[PDB]
Amino acid sequence: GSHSMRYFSTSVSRPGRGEPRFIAVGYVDDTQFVRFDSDAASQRMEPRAPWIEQEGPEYWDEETGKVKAHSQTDRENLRIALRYYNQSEAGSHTLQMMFGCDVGSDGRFLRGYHQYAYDGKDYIALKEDLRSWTAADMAAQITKRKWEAAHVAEQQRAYLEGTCVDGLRRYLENGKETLQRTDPPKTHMTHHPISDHEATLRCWALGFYPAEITLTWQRDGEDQTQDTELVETRPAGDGTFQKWAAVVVPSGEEQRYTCHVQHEGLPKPLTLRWEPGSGGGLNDIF
């Protein structure tokens, strides 16, 4: 199946309190494997996954140099943005960046990304063809014109289409154990009465990986599109994820509703009903 690598960076200015803070994180799919913190003691790139340990000191040197440089370059940028927008230096501002690539079952290149965001909104972005940019405002328009002159795009297509994918295939093979792990979700339901004539049906999915998943409430075959409560998919804290969906059911008609679960770990979508043999039948025992 498809896979992807991503590096996320965050730079925040601290008026009257020193240098801005730079936090860089790297993921392969939903698994974090590295990080960098400018205020950190070591002041060097660090491993956040077991399979990235098996790396020579040359890796940690190169990586530290590249990311430690990205700190400098983004610190410089905040300054520039201040001038462009005529903003006061006594105020805090954020600079977010995100770059990376995608692959298919093949291990072939699919899509690339190089993007920036200032104060929570898009600033400039590399288009899908990896040959032209998308400038949000007139400030970015300048940048876009400069970057075109400096050929920043081709330097970046070189990384994305080339290096980027190589390092991803290396991590997917050198990290088979975890990275190609497909954990099915451990479902079940909970019944919660709301009033004297209505009740709530919770549908749960736990310990699943990857994080992509789909819970669907259905009544007699039709989807409870806009009558269904749903939460964000949250990390369990150990690499797996959790999620739940709910509906108010006119008490008495619980069996009419069904919960459907789709996930990469299941050889087939599930169907759960509020009864024994579907997510709640361990109460006929001791």
Binding site: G26, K66, H70, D74, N77, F99
Partner: peptide, 9 residues
């Protein structure tokens, strides 16, 4: 493998 981010706005 991290990239080479060295462009100014």
């Amino acid at each position: 493998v991290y990239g080479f981010v060295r462009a100014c706005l």
